């Protein structure tokens, strides 16, 4: 709901790849969806925090 969108709190980084960036967010830091979303320029690890 109220989320916070930042680039993982760990993979603060080019992800390349959603499932790992959503897993790795979630599994390391306690973040609910993650996902290596786009926008300029590359491809990051966003993640969810219930901010």
Same mark, same amino acid.
């Given at each position: 709901? #109220?989320? %916070? ?7 603060? !980084?080019?992800? !390349?790849?959603?499932?790992?960036? #959503? ?10 969806? !993650? ?8 491809? #990051? %690890?966003? %993640?969810?925090?219930? %901010?």
């Amino acid at each position: 709901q #109220k989320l %916070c969108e930042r680039p993982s709190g760990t993979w603060s !980084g080019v992800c !390349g790849n959603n499932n790992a960036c #959503k897993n790795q967010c979630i599994n390391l830091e306690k973040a609910r969806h !993650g996902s290596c979303n786009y926008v300029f320029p590359a491809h #990051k %690890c966003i %993640c969810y925090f219930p %901010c």
